[PDB]
């Protein structure tokens, strides 16, 4: 078939996921600035629970990455079907039993096994993944930053209340997340990691609420998300300079005939203001 199988993941504001309405269509929504929200049907599991059947049902997807897909599809003249990654993960290498050989899970695993032809999601470009798949030039540049209550002054990762931690100023990230792994991996962040390990949260929503409830003083997380959170919640701000800059890219297999033109299209969309429009639509307010 010539229809491309697109795999994505729920991650706001890049991909929202909602149920269809009673007639199986997606609710009409707009922005106050006028434009209808473009929505696509994505099939995927709708029960995350462990050991559960993965009953694939049509759902409604929209957001920065879906707008980007729509544009690429029209510009490059392809059709597509979207589904949500069956195991709910972005993609890490995990060990098999009886073997020290690793296997990718998540969206990476689906792309490599042929269950998808393209990953269209906020997929961090890094060395480990690039050894196995091809990435476009970044469709979104971002990094790590720090979410605090309005009025809290923190210069960034080199602020004294971060570098010399105490329980008078608690900071933390999400357990087992890409940020936690980054803080573990880097030896020079050892005293900060020791502090964070005492305080890390189970989810970003929980960390973000704790910042609101003055139980967590600073939450360290991906800047794209935190800028979106600051945009809706006027009591919370980001603070300090970005660090550990990174980019999100479209993912394709090594042999893909789409890779060159997908990347040129992303460059074109940055240069002509399309990407800025997506930023103001989905990441600001």
């Amino acid at each position: 078939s010539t229809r491309l199988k697109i795999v994505t993941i729920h991650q706001e504001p890049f991909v929202y996921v909602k149920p269809t309405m009673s007639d199986g269509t997606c609710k009409e929504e707009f922005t106050v600035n006028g434009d209808p929200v473009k929505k696509v049907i994505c099939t995927g599991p709708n029960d995350t629970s462990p050991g559960s059947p993965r009953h694939t049902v049509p759902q409604c997807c929209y957001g920065f990455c879906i707008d980007l897909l729509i544009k690429l599809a029209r510009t490059m003249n392809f059709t597509y079907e979207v589904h949500l990654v069956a195991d709910g993960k972005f993609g890490t290498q995990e060990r098999v039993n009886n073997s020290n050989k690793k296997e990718w899970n998540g969206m990476m695993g689906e792309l490599l096994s042929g269950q998808a032809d393209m990953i269209v999601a906020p997929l961090t470009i890094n060395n480990e993944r690039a050894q196995y798949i091809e990435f476009s030039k970044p469709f979104k540049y971002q990094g790590l930053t720090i979410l605090v209550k309005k009025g809290t002054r923190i210069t960034g990762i080199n602020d004294p209340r971060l570098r010399n931690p105490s329980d008078k100023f608690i900071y933390a990230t999400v357990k087992q997340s890409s940020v936690d792994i980054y803080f573990r991996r880097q030896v020079e962040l050892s005293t900060m990691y020791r502090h964070m390990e005492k305080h890390n949260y189970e989810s970003a929503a929980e960390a973000i609420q704790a910042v609101r409830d003055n139980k967590l003083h600073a939450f360290i997380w991906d800047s794209a998300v935190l800028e979106f959170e600051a945009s809706q919640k006027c009591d919370l701000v980001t603070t300090g300079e970005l660090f550990f800059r990174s980019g999100f890219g479209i993912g394709m297999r090594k042999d893909s005939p789409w890779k060159q033109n997908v990347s040129l299209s992303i460059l074109k969309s940055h240069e002509n203001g399309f990407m800025e429009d997506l930023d103001k639509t989905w990441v600001r307010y």
């Binding site: 470009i125 890094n126 060395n127 480990e128 690039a130 050894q131 990435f135 030039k137 970044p138 979104k140 540049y141 210069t155 991996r185 880097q186 020079e188 300079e241 660090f243 550990f244 800059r245 990174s246 980019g247 990347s263 040129l264 460059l267 074109k268 940055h270 240069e271 002509n272 203001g273 990407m275 800025e276």
Partner: protein, 281 residues
């Protein structure tokens, strides 16, 4: 063969050129040899390849790549243009040196854009950049779509804004906003330093230029009076990339090595060493 011709261009703090130490005729400390063709006079095109020394953020990237990817190199400074522009259907600058095979690669403050990617290959980005706007603190500008830029004669007096021509920033403005662009050319700046002086003394209202260089200059500005608009506003976000010849056998290993430097914290070290300033916002 693993000995490579590589081209660069001075632009602090990414590439900084020093004279060689006259007593030793060697490049020491954090510097590497780099040659520059210099004319004898204006009548003939006879010249000398002058031995100089280079350092900076992009030079440290080169040193790391040379070590990790295992090549040696002969580094030279381009003298035919600057970063790269297509003139009468012929690329000049760093891009041109790669297209016409005088250099295996170009290392410097070289912006990735679509038209350059048609004639060279780019590595993954190793510095985030794009287009920013520098003003004297207090001056109000929303971004590139600000009406004062897009329809400049709708204001009396019109807003005074310019760029340094012939790079990726001018090319983007020319392609996107024809009226803006033709208006701006009377405010063309010969270089970044001229523009900063013009801003600070109020002869210019805004300077539109590469985001990475403007963020660096804002960070060291005397009195922290020149700022980039917005919350680090960047239009047409992109990166500096290493330019290689189409189909280069070096691209894959250069890409993986750059991405490894990110993962191992090496990129954070180069930021601290070269890109930190005392001003913030």
């Amino acid at each position: 063969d693993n000995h490579l011709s590589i081209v660069t261009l001075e632009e602090a703090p990414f590439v900084i050129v020093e004279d060689i130490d006259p007593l030793t005729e060697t490049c020491v400390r954090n510097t590497v040899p780099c040659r520059k063709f210099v004319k004898i006079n204006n009548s003939t095109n006879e010249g000398m390849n002058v031995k100089k020394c280079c350092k900076g953020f992009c030079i440290d990237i080169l040193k790391k790549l040379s070590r990790t990817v295992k090549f040696t190199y002969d580094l030279y400074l381009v003298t035919n243009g600057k970063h790269g522009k297509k003139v009468n259907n012929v690329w000049n600058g760093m891009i041109g040196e790669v297209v016409y095979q005088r250099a295996v690669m170009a290392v410097g403050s070289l912006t990735i854009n679509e038209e350059r990617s048609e004639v060279v290959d780019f590595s993954v980005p190793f510095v985030e950049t794009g287009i920013s706007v520098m003003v004297s603190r207090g001056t109000q500008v929303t971004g590139l779509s600000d009406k004062k830029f897009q329809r400049p004669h709708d204001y009396s007096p019109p807003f005074r804004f310019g760029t340094v021509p012939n790079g990726s920033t001018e090319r983007n403005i020319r392609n996107n906003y024809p009226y803006m662009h033709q208006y701006m050319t009377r405010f063309n700046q010969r270089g970044v330093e001229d523009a900063l002086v013009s801003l600070k003394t109020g002869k210019l209202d805004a300077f539109i230029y590469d985001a990475a260089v403007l963020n660096y200059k804002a960070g060291r500005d005397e009195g922290c009076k020149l700022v980039t608009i917005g919350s680090g506003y960047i239009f047409a976000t992109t990166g500096y990339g290493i330019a290689l010849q189409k189909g280069s056998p070096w691209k894959r290993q250069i890409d993986l090595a750059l991405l490894q430097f990110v993962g191992d914290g090496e990129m954070e070290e180069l930021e601290t060493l070269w890109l930190t300033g005392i001003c913030h916002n």
